[PDB]
Amino acid sequence: GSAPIAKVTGPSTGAVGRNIEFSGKDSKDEDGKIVSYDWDFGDGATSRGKNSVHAYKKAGTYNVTLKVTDDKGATATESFTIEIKN
């Protein structure tokens, strides 16, 4: 369709205080070209950029979202759940 497709690549698990890498590299668009990647790590924190990194302060289950926007201004968001342990 006209929306881009957002995809979040990352690990299913991680540890408190460790940098976790997330990537939007497999996002794609039939009807435009993606220009921006906005991340929400589920603990209040955000980042920008195709490849982003976050460390969680506490153990828990977090829903990471990625919103991609394309050159025509069309958006899509996708979610990824990560379990963080001590």
Numbering used by the authors: 685 to 770
Question: Which of the paper's sentences describe this entry?
Answer:
Comparison of crystal structures of ColG s2 with crystal structures of ColH s2a and s2b suggests that despite common tertiary folds, PKD-like domains can be grouped into two subsets.
Despite being solved in two crystal forms, the crystal structures of forms I and II of apo s2 from ColG are similar. Each asymmetric unit contains two noncrystallographic twofold symmetry-related molecules. All four molecules are virtually identical to each other (r.m.s.d. of <0.5 Å). The last residue is either 770 or 771. In apo s2, intermolecular antiparallel β-sheet interactions involving β-strand A could suppress dynamics of the region. Conversely, the PKD-like domain of collagenases consisting of multiple CBDs, such as s2, appears to have no surface aromatic residues. In contrast, the subset containing s2 is likely to be different; the lack of surface aromatic residues on s2 suggests that the domain is less directly involved in interactions with collagen. In this context, the spring-like dynamics of s2 may allow it to swell the fibril.
